[PDB]
Every structure is written in structure tokens, then in C-alpha cells.
Amino acid sequence: GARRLELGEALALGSGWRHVCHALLYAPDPGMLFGRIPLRYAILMQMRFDGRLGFPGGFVDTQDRSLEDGLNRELREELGEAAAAFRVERTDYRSSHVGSGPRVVAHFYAKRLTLEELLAVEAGATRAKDHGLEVLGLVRVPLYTLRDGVGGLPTFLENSFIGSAREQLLEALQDLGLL
Amino acid sequence: ARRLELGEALALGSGWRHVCHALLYAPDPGMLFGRIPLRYAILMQMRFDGRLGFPGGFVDQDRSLEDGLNRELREELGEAAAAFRVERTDYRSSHVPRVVAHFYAKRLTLEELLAVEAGATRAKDHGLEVLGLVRVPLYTLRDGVGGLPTFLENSFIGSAREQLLEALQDLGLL
Numbered sequence: 001g002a003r004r005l006e007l008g009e010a011l012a013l014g015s016g017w018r019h020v021c022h023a024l025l026y027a028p029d030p031g032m033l034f035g036r037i038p039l040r041y042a043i044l045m046q047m048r049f050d051g052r053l054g055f056p057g058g059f060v061d062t063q064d065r066s067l068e069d070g071l072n073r074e075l076r077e078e079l080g081e082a083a084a085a086f087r088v089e090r091t092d093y094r095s096s097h098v099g100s101g102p103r104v105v106a107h108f109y110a111k112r113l114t115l116e117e118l119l120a121v122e123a124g125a126t127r128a129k130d131h132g133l134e135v136l137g138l139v140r141v142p143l144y145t146l147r148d149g150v151g152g153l154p155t156f157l158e159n160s161f162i163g164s165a166r167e168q169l170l171e172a173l174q175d176l177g178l179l
Numbered sequence: 180a181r182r183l184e185l186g187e188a189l190a191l192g193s194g195w196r197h198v199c200h201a202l203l204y205a206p207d208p209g210m211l212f213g214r215i216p217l218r219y220a221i222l223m224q225m226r227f228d229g230r231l232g233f234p235g236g237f238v239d240q241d242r243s244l245e246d247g248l249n250r251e252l253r254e255e256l257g258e259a260a261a262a263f264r265v266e267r268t269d270y271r272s273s274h275v276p277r278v279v280a281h282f283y284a285k286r287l288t289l290e291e292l293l294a295v296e297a298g299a300t301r302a303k304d305h306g307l308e309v310l311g312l313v314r315v316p317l318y319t320l321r322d323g324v325g326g327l328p329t330f331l332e333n334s335f336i337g338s339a340r341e342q343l344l345e346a347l348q349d350l351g352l353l
């Protein structure tokens with residue numbers, strides 16, 4: 001796996017390093033697939049332009065005052081105006097990893113929404129600036145395993161993921177709920 | 180999966196069930212990064228089981244394959260799917276539980292396709308049977324792997340990957 005960095009460590013890296021920020025947006029979901037399988041949470045990912053599943057967010061530049069401003073800017077471009085109903089903050093920060101690209105550090109955040117907030121993000125996503133360009137569409141992460149022992153989560157994890165998105169996902173699944 | 184003619188597939192026992200699915204596509208003059216022609220917007224969807232597939236479902240009280248296909252498309256995609264009708268002339272192939280999988284490709288305008296994406300979260304199956312729609316990237320990036328080739332490494336239901344690839348070449352979407 002990619003090297004874990006401390007946040008402070010990462011921010012003290014030279015001007016040549018680029019920082020990228022992504023967020024896992026999630027909300028409790030009381031629904032039940034087929035009326036019997038608890039969904040537990042609605043968690044959003046997206047199909048990226050490169051054919052991989054990822055988390056919304058993107059590069060932070062010099063014109064971004066903080067990691068969190070860059071992140072929220074990128075979420076707005078990628079998810080649309082309903083993203084503005086909330087702010088992902090330093091309290092939502094979970095991890096930093098050395099990126100595979102030359103001198104990239106990947107910061108990961110997890111942000112609890114209400115189901116109504118998450119729903120509004122989904123409903124407006126096709127109006128996002130990057131819908132149909134960087135973002136090919138949003139998908140929810142299935143948290144259940146189906147009665148055949150493979151359908152659902154284990155099969156979702158078999159898709160292609162960008163960077164550390166798979167690891168970032170699994171760690172949040174453990175950390176957060178008993179998912 | 181075993182290929183068969185439609186007339187062939189239509190003569191089978193009630194033991195046999197029929198499923199229909201559609202690839203909705205529209206020309207897209209856009210360019211990713213202002214540089215990469217997108218060519219077509221093609222819809223696929225992430226299913227409850229964590230696999231990519233095409234919208235559609237089991238034919239059942241359905242007068243024909245087509246009635247069954249559009250009935251299911253509306254349930255999965257929502258009201259904007261009622262703006263058009265997938266017909267026998269959009270038929271592509273049939274493939275053989277004892278289920279036979281019929282595959283259709285239906286051309287829309289970009290605006291009709293966009294309306295489908297825009298209303299899909301409202302659909303009956305959204306958040307349950309369907310986890311969200313995605314477009315199929317048709318370009319290959321400069322690294323020779325990003326885009327379609329990586330897309331095709333994802334998990335697919337049934338014959339979806341093969342039905343995709345046959346449509347991409349036969350309708351000359353590449």
C-alpha cells in the first residue's frame with residue numbers, strides 16, 4: 001500500500017508537492033432492499049472519467065486558502081450546488097497517503113449528512129459542472145452481502161478504484177459504523 | 180453465453196423466463212478537457228449486487244418483449260424513459276437458470292439522454308435495485324489504459340460486457 005502521512009507532515013512538504021482531497025459523504029438509511037436487507041447507510045462514490053470508482057474531490061491549488069476550501073470547491077464542481085448546503089471541515093479529515101503520481105499527497109475526509117442532504121446531492125448531480133466530463137455518474141456503495149455470499153459489497157469491491165479509494169473506503173467502513 | 184436467433188428464443192417452454200435490457204445512447208459532441216471527443220453518451224447502471232449492467236428486466240401480463248422492456252425501463256429509470264419507446268427495430272441479440280437475455284440498443288438525442296439521467300433518482304428502483312447510472316467512457320487516455328479499457332475491468336452482470344462490446348463495434352460507436 002501507499003505510505004501514510006501525518007497531516008502536519010504533509011502540509012510541511014515543498015511547493016512542488018500537489019495535494020488532492022476527497023470525501024466520503026454518507027447518511028443513515030432506514031430502507032431495506034427487497035424489504036429484508038438493511039441498507040444501513042447511503043454512501044456515495046462516483047464513476048470517474050478514467051473508468052474507475054472514486055470519491056468526489058480533486059486537486060487543491062495555491063488559490064485555495066486551505067485543504068478544506070479546495071475540497072469544498074471541488075465538491076461543488078463535481079456534485080453541484082446541493083453540495084453547498086454543507087461544509088466538509090478539518091473535523092471530517094481522516095487520512096493522508098502518498099499518491100502514485102509525482103509528489104502527490106491524497107487527503108481523505110468522511111462527512112456525515114442527513115439523508116435529505118445526501119438525497120439532494122444525488123438529485124442535482126447531473127447539473128454539476130463536471131457531470132458527463134470528469135464525473136460519469138454517482139453510485140451508492142452496497143453495504144450488505146447477498147444470500148449467495150458474493151453479491152453486494154464483496155462484488156462492489158471487485159470493481160476498479162482510483163489510488164487508495166478502495167483502502168479509504170474499507171477503513172471508513174470499519175472506523176465509522178459496524179459496517 | 181449461448182447466442183440464439185429471436186424466433187428461436189421465442190419458441191421455448193414456460194420453464195423459460197425472458198429478460199430484456201437496453202443500451203441508451205446519444206451522440207455527444209462534447210470533449211473531455213476540451214480535447215478528447217466523447218463521441219457518445221452511453222448509459223449503464225450499478226446494480227444492487229455491485230455489478231454494472233443495462234437497464235431493463237424480466238418480461239412477464241406483458242403483451243410483448245417490448246411492452247415488458249419499456250415497462251421495466253420506466254420503473255428503473257423514471258418518467259423521462261416514457262419520452263421514447265424501445266421497439267423491435269432496436270433489437271440486437273438473444274443469449275441463454277433457464278433465462279433468455281434479449282438486448283436492445285436505442286438511439287436518443289443528448290437532451291433525451293440527459294433527461295433520463297436527471298430524473299433517475301426519482302425512479303422506483305433508485306437506491307434499492309439500482310444504485311446509480313454511469314456513462315461508459317469510450318476514449319482511451321494517453322497512458323493507454325484509462326477510459327474504456329479500465330471501465331471494462333469493472334464487474335458486469337450476465338453478458339452485459341459482451342453486449343456492450345458488440346454494440347460499440349456494430350453501431351460503430353468507436
Ligand SMILES: Nc1ncnc2c1ncn2[C@@H]1O[C@H](COP(=O)(O)OP(=O)(O)OC[C@H]2O[C@@H](O)[C@H](O)[C@@H]2O)[C@@H](O)[C@H]1O
Nearest residue numbers: 020022054055057058059099101106162163164165168212
Ligand atoms: N482516492 C484517492 N486516493 C489516492 N489518490 C487519488 C485518489 N483519487 C485521485 N487520486 C489521484 O489524484 C489525481 C487527481 O485526482 P482527481 O480527483 O482526478 O482530481 P481533479 O482535480 O478532480 O481532476 C483531475 C485532473 O487531472 C488531470 O489528469 C485531468 O486534467 C483532470 O482535470 C488522480 O489522477 C489520482 O492519481
Ligand SMILES: Nc1ncnc2c1ncn2[C@@H]1O[C@H](COP(=O)(O)OP(=O)(O)OC[C@H]2O[C@@H](O)[C@H](O)[C@@H]2O)[C@@H](O)[C@H]1O
Nearest residue numbers: 198200232233235236237274278280308336337338339342
Ligand atoms: N445484460 C444481461 N445479460 C444477461 N443476463 C442478465 C443481464 N442482466 C441481468 N441478467 C440476469 O437476468 C436476471 C435478472 O435481471 P434483472 O435486470 O435484475 O431483472 P429484474 O426484473 O430487474 O430483477 C429483479 C431482481 O430481484 C432479485 O431477487 C433478482 O436477483 C433479480 O435480479 C438475473 O439472473 C441476471 O443474472
Ligand SMILES: [Mg+2]
Nearest residue numbers: 057058074134
Ligand atoms: Mg474535479
Ligand SMILES: [Mg+2]
Nearest residue numbers: 056057058134
Ligand atoms: Mg476529482
Ligand SMILES: [Mg+2]
Nearest residue numbers: 235236255308
Ligand atoms: Mg428491475
Ligand SMILES: [Mg+2]
Nearest residue numbers: 233234235236
Ligand atoms: Mg435491472
